[PDB]
Structure 1
Amino acid sequence: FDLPLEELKKYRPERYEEKDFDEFWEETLAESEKFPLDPVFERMESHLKTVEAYDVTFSGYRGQRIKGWLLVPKLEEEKLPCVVQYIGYNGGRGFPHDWLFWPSMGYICFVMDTRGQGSGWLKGDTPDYPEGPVDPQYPGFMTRGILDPRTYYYRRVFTDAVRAVEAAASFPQVDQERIVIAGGSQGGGIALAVSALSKKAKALLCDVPFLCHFRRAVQLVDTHPYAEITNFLKTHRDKEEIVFRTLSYFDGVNFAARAKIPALFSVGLMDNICPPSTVFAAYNYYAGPKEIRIYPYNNHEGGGSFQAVEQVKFLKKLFE
């Protein structure tokens, strides 16, 4: 349904960002750095036997305390590599045993809970906090605070996510040379923002990323969650320029252009949640060394368990 693959490979649409994109993010991170990280780990009583699980609490946007899990595989090596895992839309940190893959492959896993979500497919424990008034919005998180980038929901999520990497680095068994940031869909868009904003991330795993090339996305598909934006615009006919102006500060295509760390991307060519031209726009602008795995017959599931193995191989080669 989207551009054919040879056009996708060369798709580099003109980028739109405001003159103060960097300043906005510098100011944001500076203000939140004024609050101590105060990363706290508490070993959980758990039935898990191959992994130690810890409850995590750390300061994200404006000192707000974000939950996480830290999963440490019970192995002989002193320092371990670490994957910081961001969660898809309407998910949350769930139970420790929901996140066994990376530890089973020998990596400490830091799972960041997602402020205010945690109610669609996997439970969460972290609340959101708005700046002040909660403006008229369409149901969901995509239009929460959308009339100003200072009030926009993903400002708070992305800052949480940058601080999560510092929180992971605070665990002494983490090898700070081998901290990976990872996610799919919303998780992928979060990780992409982190890949540009974090000083500590060493590699990026970015699967079927959401939060990319918003203007084209709402023109291309009527699926959720991009359709929250479209539905808002159907009602607020006077706010089109403001909406896209705000979203430009959160668009993965704009972060991709600033990111320098090694990355592995994936894309499903039949994905109508995260359309491939949106994924390719981010991938093609990504400034660091990069590869993409292309799944021509998959929808939003992308490469699934095949991709998981591709990721393990990729990291092993990068870090060897």
Structure 2
Amino acid sequence: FFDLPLEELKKYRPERYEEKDFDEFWEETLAESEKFPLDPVFERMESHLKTVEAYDVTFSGYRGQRIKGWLLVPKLEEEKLPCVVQYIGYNGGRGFPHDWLFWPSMGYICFVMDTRGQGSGWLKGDTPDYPEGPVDPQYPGFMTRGILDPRTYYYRRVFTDAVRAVEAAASFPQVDQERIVIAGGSQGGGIALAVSALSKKAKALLCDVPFLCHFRRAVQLVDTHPYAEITNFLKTHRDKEEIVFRTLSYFDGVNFAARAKIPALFSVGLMDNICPPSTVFAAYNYYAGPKEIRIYPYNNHEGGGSFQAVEQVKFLKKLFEK
């Protein structure tokens, strides 16, 4: 227990920092990318999978750039199925179709979005990043890539891809548009949180041990990666503090949370030193839609693990009967 006590976490609502053009920045970003056709493509693949049909996905994300993914459809009688759009943790990528059997086995179509330029840490990826011309001086990793200007910042592109991933999922014929869920843990959680504010198609949010929240506090509290990439950039570029946090404010899950309206299930580990509880609760507490949080007092970044998976299935079942 290195963070605020739980009684204080439950009330923690730090003063939010955002620029006055926060919304306009996102409106312009999405409008510019909507000018390119989504051109979603689903290509059935040869697989040893027997209970699921697997498709190679391609769609246009940020600025028409082609993003890969998987679509896993469980072999069931129902003509329309509910659907989970799944975002991936830091240094991960879409891997193989059989890496994502959980939701299909629970009777949900699952759209897994590959993460541009990552896919080399713990699971392979196939989607490149495409920068806005020059790739500035940065610290190793993604956290500081383009960080001196929100228009060039890496997560501008990722978030836009993620919003478009929902539209691509929605274009698949047996996807029930009334039951599209956006889901992620860690980086995936932070991507999902941004999507829960920017997407018009998402109906529910699953958001575990979210990353990309309350940056200024994160960097103060922990010296773990990936948040430490920002700290290390700041150690060297000592004249850039104000600029760095200005940029980051446009991508902070706390600011997106204040705008999200769809129902949400959060989870948090009180001993999580990768995504500290105070950063997660800051997001949760500002989250503007109907919400619940599962608190795992003795867990680190693993969170509630399989226990939380059970909670997520129960939560959605109940949500989509009401």
Q: Name the TM tier (shorter chain).
A: over 0.9
CA–CA distance in 1 between the matches of 2:165 and 2:76? 24
Deviations 1:253-306 (A, max 9, x none): 000000000000000000000000000000000000000000000000000000
**C-alpha displacement of 1:132:** 1.1
Q: What secondary structure, in the 3-state scheme, does the structure 1 residue paired with 2:137 have?
A: coil
What whole-Å deviation, never above 9, does each CA across 1:15-68 have from its counterpart, x for those lacking one?
A: 000000000000000000000000000000000000000000000000000000
TM-score where L is the length of structure 1: 1.00
Identity %: 100
Q: Deviations over 1:95-123 (max 9, x none)?
A: 00000000000000000000000000000
Residue 118 of structure 2 is matched in structure 1 by: 117
Q: Secondary structure at the match of 1:238?
A: coil
Deviation, structure 1 residue 144? 0.1
Counterpart Cα distance in 2 of 1:85 and 1:101: 11
Q: Distance in 2 between matches of 1:130 and 1:217?
A: 26
Residue of structure 2 equivalent to 1:11: 12
Q: How far, CA to CA, are the matches of 1:141 and 1:110 in structure 2?
A: 23
Q: In 2, distance between residues paired with 1:77 and 1:36?
A: 30
Query: Deviation per CA, 1:166-221, whole angstroms, max 9, x where unpaired?
Result: 00000000000000000000000000000000000000000000000000000000
Instruction: Please report how far the alpha carbon of residue 77 of structure 1 lies from its aligned counterpart in structure 2 after TM superposition.
Output: 0.9
Determine helix, strand or coil for the equivalent of 1:205.
strand
Give, in whole Å, the separation in 2 of the partners of 1:207 and 1:294.
10
> What SS is found at the alignment partner of 1:88?
coil
Shift of 1:76: 1.1
- Supply the distance in 2 between the matched residues of 1:4 and 1:213 (Cα, whole angstroms): 18
Unaligned runs of 5+ in 1: none
With the length of structure 2 as denominator, give the TM-score of the two structures. 0.99
User: Match of 1:200, SS?
Assistant: coil
Aligned position for 1:41: 42
C-alpha RMSD over aligned residues: 0.2
Distance 1:236 1:49 in 2: 53
Task: Give the Cα separation in 1 of the matches to 2:229 and 2:178.
Answer: 39
For 1:49, what is the secondary structure of its paired residue?
coil
CA distance in 2, matches of 1:130, 1:239: 21
2-structure distance, mates of 1:104, 1:244: 42
Q: Report the Cα distance in structure 1 between the residues aligned to 2:79 and 2:69, rounded to whole angstroms.
A: 23
**Displaced runs of 4+ in structure 1, greater than 3 A?**
none
**Aligned counterparts of 1:92 and 1:224: Cα–Cα separation in 2:** 18
TM-superposed deviation, 1:153: 0.0
SS in 1 for 2:315: helix
